[PDB]
Amino acid sequence: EFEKGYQSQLYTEMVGINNISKQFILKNPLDDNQTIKSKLERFVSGYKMNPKIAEKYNVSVHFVNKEKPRAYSLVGVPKTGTGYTLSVWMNSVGDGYKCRDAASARAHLETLSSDVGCEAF
Numbered sequence: 001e002f003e004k005g006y007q008s009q010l011y012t013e014m015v016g017i018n019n020i021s022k023q024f025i026l027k028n029p030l031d032d033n034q035t036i037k038s039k040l041e042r043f044v045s046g047y048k049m050n051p052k053i054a055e056k057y058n059v060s061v062h063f064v065n066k067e068k069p070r071a072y073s074l075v076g077v078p079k080t081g082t083g084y085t086l087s088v089w090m091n092s093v094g095d096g097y098k099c100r101d102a103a104s105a106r107a108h109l110e111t112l113s114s115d116v117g118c119e120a121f
Contacts, residue, residue, distance in 0.1 A: 007086035007098055010057050011121075013049045014074050014090055017059060021092070025070055037069040044074065056082055064108070077102035089118065096121055 024039060031039065044061040048054060059076045063069045072092045078084035087105030090096040099105040099118035109118045 003084060003086055006053065006056060006084070007088060009050070009053055010059075010076050011088050011090075011096060011098065013053055014059060014076050014088060015096070017044060017047055017074060018090060018092065018094070021061075021072065021074075033067055033069050037063060037066060040069070040072060055079070056084060062106075062108075073108060075105050075108075077105050087118075 021040060021043065024043060025036065028036065028039070040061050044059060047059060049057070049059070056079060057076050058079055059074060062073045062075055064071060064073065070092065074088075074090050076088040078087070085101045087099040087102045088097065089099060089105045089108055097105075097110060097118035097120055099109065100112070100116055104116045104118050109116070110120070111117050112119050
């Protein structure tokens with residue numbers, strides 16, 4: 001399908017977003033947790049993907065513990081009205097997952113069960 005096709009181009013994009021985010025961290029080791037969290041949020045929500053992925057998907061940065069914000073994650077889920085479901089999420093240590101639906105992406109799930117969930121790649 002074109003859709004799996006797109007879910008996979010979205011991952012490649014998010015890898016590129018993750019690579020630039022790494023540089024935010026290396027280049028600014030003096031930033032306090034508040035500052036790097038907002039800097040990453042601005043960078044990731046401003047981020048411009050390839051025009052035909054940008055129309056389809058939203059990417060956003062999440063922090064499981066906001067006082068360890070160098071530990072971030074990226075979530076990528078369809079824009080609304082597009083009729084899409086397939087999603088993605090990834091670690092800042094580079095674990096990547098393709099997810100059957102946005103909710104499992106937002107939930108940071110790592111396995112397929114109950115006909116929802118995510119699996120690695």
